[PDB]
Amino acid sequence: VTVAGIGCRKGAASDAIIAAVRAAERAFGVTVDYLATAPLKADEAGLAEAAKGLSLSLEIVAQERLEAVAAETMTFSQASLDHSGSPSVSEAAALAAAGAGARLVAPRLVVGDVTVAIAMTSD
């Protein structure tokens, strides 16, 4: 199971998100079967519409859960990230939705101004 964590600036078109996910799939040789995000801000419709377009489920991960995941990856689950220290918001969202013990399999990707983080889980 592979999760794509999505971050974007307030006011992002659904087709920009869709393009970003499919570009991530091609660039990394993965196939996303689940979408994830942090608590969405002022604009929220673009991301929800893109999940519909991609025919994928979306998990809007609570801030408490994001914080927990970020804390875990800095203590004993440091093998979950492929960079130093704290995960980014999108990275922590993908890892939270992925669950235990997921890991990040690709470097942080920005396509336009949509951030895509890919995580894969144990199974």
Next chain:
Amino acid sequence: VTVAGIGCRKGAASDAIIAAVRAAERAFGVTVDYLATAPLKADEAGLAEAAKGLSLSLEIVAQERLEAVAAETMTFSQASLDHSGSPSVSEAAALAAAGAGARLVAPRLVVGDVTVAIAMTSD
């Protein structure tokens, strides 16, 4: 793990959703640790804000996944629902987010015009 599937009419206040979830918790003797919904319609902000207020994650379950779950519960997983035939949209959302083999543990609840379906999973 216990999932509450949420359905509401277009234009529902976040506090109405919150009230509905906490009333479900009290009425059934459960504690919701995960929220779920069907592809959201014209209004979408009320439900996302309520998950933030309840400090719970939300899964917006894709229509393909909802259909699959509804199909499963009418074939061999009929023990997942406590009524006859097809699950409701909220029931199928809660069961999808809950995963395999969840079951519905409480009857369909409406509080105001917010529908709440509670599912519990194997673990």
